[PDB]
C-alpha cells in the first residue's frame, strides 16, 4: 500500500471567470478555445475591460487532482503560488478538497498567477494567463517522498511556458520510474504543443512518459496533420497509453494495436467547457490506480468531464464518487 | 436631469461561498439563516473547516447598486476596500457593473472585508463576515456631490456595527434632504435590528429615513412581537413608506393606509437565497426612481429577487432588464 493514487504538477492558478459575446474576443484579440498567454500590462488592459466576474481555483492538475480526490481517490499535488490571498484561496481550496499540497510559496512577488476565463454563448472558454508566482516553480519544489509513493505522477504540457518547471518534471520522471511507478502527461493546449512539439515528442519516445492524454485538436498539432485517424495511429506509436478525447464524440483510449472506444455522456446543456480536459485525466488516473479495465478508465473520465462541463467553474461542486456509484462504476 | 437614481452605501465584502449541511452550522455554532459577525481568528478557524469555495463580489448594498445598474438605472456606490487583491476584485466588479465607485483604500491592513456564506440543501445562506477595512468607512468618504445628485440613498442596517459608518450616513441624510432627495435603509438582519433598535426607530421617526426595507423577521424583531399584523401597523406609522418581504408569500408595500401585496414570481428551485433582500431593494428603487406606481415597484423587487435566488452568488449574472421586458413590466 503506497501514500498517493495520483500526484499532479501544474500551474497553480486562480480564475476569473466571465460570459462574453464572440465579438469580445474579437476585439480583444483573444483566440477563442485557447490558452493565451498574457503579461502583466496585458492581464491589466483585458480586466479592465471583463465584466463583473466569479473566482474559483483553477490550474489544469489542480482541477485533476482535485477531481481524484473527489472520487475518493488519494492524490497530491505540486504548484507555486505567492504568498497573497489568491494564493490563500488556492492553498485553502485544494487542501479543503483533500489534496495533499504543501508547496512552499517564495514571498509575494512576483504574485500568485490568474487566468481571465471567457466563457461565450456555446459555452467555450478562451483563457488569458498571467503566469505570476508559476514561473519560480522548479526541482526545489519536488518532494520526492511524495514522487516515490505516488503510483502515478501526472503532469501538464502547459509546464513548458514557465523556465524551470520541466527540471522538476525530469527529476519526477527519474524518481517515478526508479520507484517502478508511472508518469503521465496532457497535452494541455493546441498552440501549447504547437510550441513543445518536439520536446513532447521526446518525453514520449524516450519513455519519460507512459501515458498521454490528447484532445482531437492537440493531437492533429502533435503531428501537425489534418488526418485524425493518422494523428491517433501515430500517438499510439509513440507512447504507452493514449487517451484521446473528442468532445462530444467521446473518447478513444489506445494501447498498442487496441482501441477502446467510450461515448459522451448525454447534456442537459453545456454550461461552461473548463475543466473538462481536466476531469477526464480525473476520471481515468482514479480508474487506472484502482486497476480497472481501460474501457472503464475512459468511462469514468467521461463521467467525470460530462459534469464538469454542466456548472460554472473547474472543479465540480457535487460528488463526483457519488455519480460513479450511482453510474455503476463505483 | 440628475447623475444618479440610487446611490446605495454600505459595507464592501468578498463573498466566500460554500455548500454545507446543517449539522456544519451547528457544530460551528453558526446562527443559520443569520450574519454572524466574527473576528480574524474565528475568520481563519471557520475557513480552515470550509469546503471548497468560489468568490463574488458581495454586501448588502452593494449588490443592491450592481442591481440597479443591471435594470438600467444610473447608481453609485460608497464603500471602503482595502489595497490588496481582493478589494481589486471588489472595485473591478462593481465598476465593471457601471456602478459609479470612488471610495479610495486607505492602506492595506486591515484587510477587505470577507463573508464565508454557508448555503445548506434548502437553499439557505449563513453568513460570517469578518468587517476587515469596513471599519474605516466614515464622514470622509462622503461625496457630497454624488448624494446631491442622486435621487434616492439608500443604506445598510448592517453600518451600525462598524464605528463611524453612522457619521457618514447622517451627513448623507442631511445633504439628501437639503436637495429634495430621499432617504432609504434596510433593516439588514433581525440581530442586526436587535443591536440598533432605538436607534433605527428614532431614524425612522426622525425623518432621516423615507423609505424602509424588511423582511417578515427583521419586522418582528423590530417591534418585538409575534404578531406580524402588528409590525406591518407599526411599521407604517413609523415611516413615510415601507416594503416588506415574505420570502415566498411575495412582498406588502405600505404608504400611510394604503397597502399594496404583491406576488412571488414562479422558480424552479431554491439554490442560494444569498441577495434576494439585496435585489428586491434593486428592483424596488428602480422602479421608484422612474416614477412607476408602488405595486408596480413591487413588482419589479419581486422578479428581480426571483431571479438572484437560483443561482450562485448574490449579483445576477443574467440581464435584469432582459427579464423586466420579458415579464412585460419593461
Ligand atoms: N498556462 C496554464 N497552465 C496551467 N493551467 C492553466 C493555464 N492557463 C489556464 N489554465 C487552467 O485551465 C483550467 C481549465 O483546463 C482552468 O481552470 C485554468 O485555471
Ligand atoms: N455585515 C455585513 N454588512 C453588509 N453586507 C453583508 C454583511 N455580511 C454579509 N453581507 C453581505 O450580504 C449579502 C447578501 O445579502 C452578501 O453578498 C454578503 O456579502
Ligand atoms: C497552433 C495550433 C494548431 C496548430 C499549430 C499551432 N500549427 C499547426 C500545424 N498543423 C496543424 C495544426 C497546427
Ligand atoms: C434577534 C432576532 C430576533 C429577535 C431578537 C434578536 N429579539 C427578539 C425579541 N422578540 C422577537 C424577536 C426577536
Ligand atoms: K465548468
Ligand atoms: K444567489
Same mark, same amino acid.
Given at each position: 500500500?503506497?501514500?498517493?493514487?495520483?500526484?499532479?504538477?501544474?500551474?497553480?492558478?486562480?480564475?476569473?471567470?466571465?460570459?462574453?459575446?464572440?465579438?469580445?474576443?474579437? *476585439?480583444?484579440?483573444? $483566440?477563442?478555445?485557447?490558452?493565451? /498567454?498574457? #503579461?502583466?500590462? !496585458? %492581464?491589466?488592459?483585458?480586466?479592465?475591460?471583463?465584466?463583473?466576474?466569479?473566482?474559483?481555483?483553477?490550474?489544469?492538475?489542480?482541477?485533476?487532482?482535485?477531481?481524484?480526490?473527489?472520487?475518493?481517490?488519494?492524490?497530491?499535488?505540486?504548484?507555486?503560488?505567492?504568498?497573497?490571498?489568491?494564493?490563500?484561496?488556492?492553498?485553502?481550496?485544494?487542501?479543503?478538497?483533500?489534496?495533499?499540497?504543501?508547496?512552499?510559496?517564495?514571498?509575494?512577488?512576483?504574485?500568485?498567477?490568474?487566468?481571465?476565463?471567457?466563457?461565450?454563448?456555446?459555452?467555450?472558454?478562451?483563457?488569458?494567463?498571467?503566469?505570476?508566482?508559476?514561473?519560480?516553480?522548479?526541482?526545489?519544489?519536488?518532494?520526492?517522498?511524495?514522487?516515490? *509513493?505516488?503510483?502515478? $505522477?501526472?503532469?501538464?504540457?502547459? /509546464?513548458? #511556458?514557465?523556465? !524551470? %518547471?520541466?527540471?522538476?518534471?525530469?527529476?519526477?520522471?527519474?524518481?517515478?520510474?526508479?520507484?517502478?511507478?508511472?508518469?503521465?502527461?496532457?497535452?494541455?493546449?493546441?498552440?501549447?504543443?504547437?510550441?513543445?512539439?518536439?520536446?513532447?515528442?521526446?518525453?514520449?519516445?524516450?519513455?519519460?512518459?507512459?501515458?498521454?492524454?490528447?484532445?482531437?485538436?492537440?493531437?492533429?498539432?502533435?503531428?501537425?496533420?489534418?488526418?485524425?485517424?493518422?494523428?491517433?495511429?501515430?500517438?499510439?506509436?509513440?507512447?504507452?497509453?493514449?487517451?484521446?478525447?473528442?468532445?462530444?464524440?467521446?473518447?478513444?483510449?489506445?494501447?498498442?494495436?487496441?482501441?477502446?472506444?467510450?461515448?459522451?455522456?448525454?447534456?442537459?446543456?453545456?454550461?461552461?467547457?473548463?475543466?473538462?480536459?481536466?476531469?477526464?485525466?480525473?476520471?481515468?488516473?482514479?480508474?487506472?490506480?484502482?486497476?480497472?479495465?481501460?474501457?472503464?478508465?475512459?468511462?469514468?473520465?467521461?463521467?467525470?468531464?460530462?459534469?464538469?462541463?454542466?456548472?460554472?467553474?473547474?472543479?465540480?461542486?457535487?460528488?463526483?464518487?457519488?455519480?460513479?456509484?450511482?453510474?455503476?462504476?463505483?
Amino acid at each position: 500500500m503506497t501514500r498517493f493514487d495520483v500526484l499532479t504538477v501544474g500551474n497553480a492558478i486562480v480564475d476569473i471567470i466571465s460570459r462574453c459575446n464572440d465579438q469580445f474576443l474579437i *476585439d480583444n484579440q483573444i $483566440t477563442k478555445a485557447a490558452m493565451n /498567454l498574457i #503579461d502583466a500590462e !496585458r %492581464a491589466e488592459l483585458l480586466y479592465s475591460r471583463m465584466g463583473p466576474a466569479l473566482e474559483a481555483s483553477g490550474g489544469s492538475a489542480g482541477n485533476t487532482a482535485a477531481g481524484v480526490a473527489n472520487l475518493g481517490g488519494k492524490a497530491a499535488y505540486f504548484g507555486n503560488v505567492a504568498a497573497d490571498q489568491l494564493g490563500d484561496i488556492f492553498t485553502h481550496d485544494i487542501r479543503a478538497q483533500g489534496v495533499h499540497y504543501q508547496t512552499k510559496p517564495k514571498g509575494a512577488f512576483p504574485p500568485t498567477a490568474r487566468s481571465m476565463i471567457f466563457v461565450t454563448e456555446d459555452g467555450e472558454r478562451s483563457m488569458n494567463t498571467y503566469l505570476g508566482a508559476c514561473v519560480e516553480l522548479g526541482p526545489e519544489d519536488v518532494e520526492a517522498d511524495v514522487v516515490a *509513493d505516488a503510483k502515478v $505522477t501526472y503532469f501538464e504540457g502547459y /509546464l513548458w #511556458d514557465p523556465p !524551470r %518547471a520541466k527540471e522538476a518534471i525530469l527529476d519526477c520522471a527519474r524518481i517515478a520510474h526508479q520507484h517502478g511507478r508511472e508518469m503521465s502527461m496532457t497535452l494541455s493546449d493546441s498552440f501549447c504543443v504547437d510550441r513543445y512539439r518536439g520536446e513532447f515528442l521526446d518525453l514520449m519516445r524516450s519513455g519519460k512518459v507512459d501515458i498521454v492524454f490528447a484532445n482531437r485538436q492537440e493531437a492533429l498539432s502533435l503531428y501537425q496533420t489534418d488526418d485524425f485517424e493518422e494523428a491517433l495511429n501515430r500517438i499510439a506509436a509513440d507512447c504507452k497509453i493514449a487517451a484521446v478525447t473528442m468532445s462530444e464524440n467521446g473518447a478513444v483510449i489506445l494501447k498498442g494495436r487496441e482501441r477502446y472506444y467510450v461515448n459522451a455522456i448525454r447534456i442537459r446543456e453545456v454550461v461552461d467547457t473548463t475543466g473538462a480536459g481536466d476531469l477526464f485525466a480525473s476520471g481515468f488516473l482514479y480508474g487506472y490506480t484502482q486497476g480497472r479495465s481501460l474501457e472503464d478508465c475512459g468511462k469514468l473520465g467521461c463521467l467525470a468531464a460530462g459534469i464538469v462541463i454542466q456548472q460554472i467553474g473547474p472543479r465540480p461542486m457535487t460528488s463526483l464518487s457519488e455519480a460513479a456509484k450511482q453510474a455503476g462504476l463505483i
